[PDB]
Amino acid sequence: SDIAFLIDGSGSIIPHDFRRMKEFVSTVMEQLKKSKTLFSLMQYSEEFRIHFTFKEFQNNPNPRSLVKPITQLLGRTHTATGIRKVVRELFNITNGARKNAFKILVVITDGEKFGDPLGYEDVIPEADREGVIRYVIGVGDAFRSEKSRQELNTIASKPPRDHVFQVNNFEALKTIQNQLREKIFAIEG
Amino acid sequence: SDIAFLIDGSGSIIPHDFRRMKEFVSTVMEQLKKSKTLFSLMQYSEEFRIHFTFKEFQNNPNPRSLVKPITQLLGRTHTATGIRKVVRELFNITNGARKNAFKILVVITDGEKFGDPLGYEDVIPEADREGVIRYVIGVGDAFRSEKSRQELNTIASKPPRDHVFQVNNFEALKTIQNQLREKIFAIEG
C-alpha cells in the first residue's frame, strides 16, 4: 500500500499539541509497517511541505527519525489545495508511487477550510478517479456542530461512518489509535 | 448587455503602460455604451479588486469617473482565479447582472498565469455553462511564442482567431478599438 498522511500545521495548533500530533503519526506508521509498505508525509497551511516521499521513505525507513525534525508552518487552513497536492505529487510515479498498489490517505486537521481558492468539488473527483482511500480525523471544538462535521463527511470516503474520527483534543488521539490501525489492515489482509 | 472587464494589475506593467491600459478601458466603454448596456470592472493579481458592479454603474454610468480612481496592485498573475471570480461574483444577480442578458467578458493580460492554485480546466467549464463570451487582449513579448499564444487561445471563446488580439505593447492597443468594439456590437445589433 502507498500510504500518505496530510498534517494540519496552521497557527491555531499550539506547540505542545503540534508535538503530540507528530508522535501519533510516528507511532502509527510503526504499527502499520510491513515489508511492502511505503509511507509519505505532507503538512499544509497556506504553504505546502513535502517532508518525505515514498521513494525517500525506502531510503531511510525510520518513522521516528524522519518525523523528528518537522517544524510547524503556522498559516491558515487550506485543506483542498492540500488534497490536490497529495493526489498530483505524492501518488505520482516519479515520487515512487507503485502502479498496482492501494492508495490510502489519512487526513488530520483542527479546522474548517478558510480562504482556499478551491472547493472540495474541485479535488474529491480527482481523488476518486485515482482511486484514493481517505480517512479523516477532526481534532478540537471546531467540528463541534451538526455543521462543521459536515466538512469531514465531505472530505472522507463513504459510508462516512467508517472513515471519520473526531476527538476533543490532541491528547486524545491515542484513543482512536487502535481502531484506525485495524481499518487500514482489512484493505489487504 | 452585461459587459465586464478583467484587468491585469501585475507589477510587470509600468505605471504609464498601466495608465494607457486604463485609458484604453475608458474609451471602449464610451464607444460601446448603448442604452441598456451595463459595465463592471475588476483588477486582478495575486490579489483581486471589485472596482465596480453593473448595479452601481447604472446609478453613475460614467466611464471617466469610475475608471479614474483605480490603483495598481503589482503582485503576480492569477488569471484563472480572476476568471472564476468574475463569473461567480460580477455576474451575480445582486450585482446588477440581469438574467435575460448577454454576458461578455474582455480580459487584458501581460503574461502567463504564475503560481495559481486553479487551472483553466478548473474554471473554463463553468464559464460556458452560464454562457459568458470571452475576448482576450494579450500584450507584448511575453506572448510571442508557440506556447504562450496557447494560453491565449485557451481563455477565449471559439473560434479563437476572432476572439484573440495579440498587440505589441500598451501604446498599440489604440490600434484595435474599432475591432474589439465592432465585434461586440454585432451581437446585439
Side-chain angles (χ1 to χ4, degrees), chain A residues 81 84 88 116-119 122 126, chain B residues 81 84 116-119 121-122 126:
Chain A
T81 301
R84 180 82 89 181
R88 303 189 186 190
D116 184 4
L118 289 53
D122 299 325
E126 290 185 75
Chain B
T81 289
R84 173 176 289 173
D116 177 20
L118 311 78
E121 305 66 87
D122 299 346
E126 61 184 307

Side-chain angles (χ1 to χ4, degrees), chain A residues 87-150:
Chain A
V87 169
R88 303 189 186 190
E89 308 195 288
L90 301 178
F91 301 98
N92 191 0
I93 173 186
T94 59
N95 292 329
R98 296 165 303 167
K99 176 182 64 181
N100 292 297
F102 282 83
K103 307 305 189 181
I104 290 69
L105 169 76
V106 185
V107 182
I108 313 164
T109 181
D110 82 329
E112 302 181 301
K113 183 173 59 58
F114 180 78
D116 184 4
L118 289 53
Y120 298 107
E121 311 73 32
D122 299 325
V123 310
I124 298 304
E126 290 185 75
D128 306 304
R129 44 163 272 288
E130 285 301 1
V132 167
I133 308 174
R134 309 159 325 230
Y135 294 80
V136 178
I137 308 181
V139 183
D141 282 318
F143 303 91
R144 71 177 184 183
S145 61
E146 181 177 321
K147 295 186 176 185
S148 56
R149 59 189 61 171
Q150 183 59 37

Side-chain angles (χ1 to χ4, degrees), chain A:
Chain A
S1 292
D2 296 342
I3 309 174
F5 286 76
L6 183 62
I7 67 173
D8 178 352
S10 65
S12 74
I13 299 174
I14 62 175
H16 71 267
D17 297 326
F18 178 78
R19 164 174 27 155
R20 298 166 182 164
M21 180 195 293
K22 291 175 55 188
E23 187 64 330
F24 178 98
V25 168
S26 290
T27 297
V28 169
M29 300 169 59
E30 294 175 357
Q31 294 179 4
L32 299 173
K33 177 68 64 69
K34 215 172 311 71
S35 205
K36 278 293 164 292
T37 306
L38 300 176
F39 296 104
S40 184
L41 197 174
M42 179 178 294
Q43 73 179 293
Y44 72 97
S45 69
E46 302 174 61
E47 303 193 18
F48 303 90
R49 298 288 195 168
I50 301 183
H51 296 290
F52 56 104
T53 69
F54 299 117
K55 78 91 69 184
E56 296 175 334
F57 174 74
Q58 60 176 301
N59 279 306
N60 187 13
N62 200 86
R64 295 289 177 174
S65 64
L66 295 177
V67 174
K68 179 291 65 178
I70 291 186
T71 58
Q72 184 168 18
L73 282 178
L74 290 179
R76 319 195 72 155
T77 315
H78 288 28
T79 306
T81 301
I83 293 182
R84 180 82 89 181
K85 285 176 157 293
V86 177
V87 169
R88 303 189 186 190
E89 308 195 288
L90 301 178
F91 301 98
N92 191 0
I93 173 186
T94 59
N95 292 329
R98 296 165 303 167
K99 176 182 64 181
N100 292 297
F102 282 83
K103 307 305 189 181
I104 290 69
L105 169 76
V106 185
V107 182
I108 313 164
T109 181
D110 82 329
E112 302 181 301
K113 183 173 59 58
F114 180 78
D116 184 4
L118 289 53
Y120 298 107
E121 311 73 32
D122 299 325
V123 310
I124 298 304
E126 290 185 75
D128 306 304
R129 44 163 272 288
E130 285 301 1
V132 167
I133 308 174
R134 309 159 325 230
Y135 294 80
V136 178
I137 308 181
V139 183
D141 282 318
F143 303 91
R144 71 177 184 183
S145 61
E146 181 177 321
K147 295 186 176 185
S148 56
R149 59 189 61 171
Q150 183 59 37
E151 185 174 9
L152 299 176
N153 311 281
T154 296
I155 300 181
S157 291
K158 302 171 60 176
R161 277 178 41 180
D162 300 296
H163 302 78
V164 189
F165 305 85
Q166 58 167 144
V167 50
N168 298 302
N169 58 69
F170 291 87
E171 183 174 60
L173 293 180
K174 303 59 180 59
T175 68
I176 68 70
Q177 191 178 325
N178 277 307
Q179 52 288 239
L180 177 70
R181 174 182 61 195
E182 305 305 323
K183 287 63 187 298
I184 298 170
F185 299 142
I187 298 301
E188 301 190 89

Side-chain angles (χ1 to χ4, degrees), chain B residues 171-188:
Chain B
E171 284 294 340
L173 297 182
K174 315 307 163 63
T175 65
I176 56 171
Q177 300 178 1
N178 298 351
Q179 293 54 12
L180 171 62
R181 180 186 64 171
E182 60 170 13
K183 291 182 179 179
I184 293 186
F185 284 156
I187 60 185
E188 184 64 301

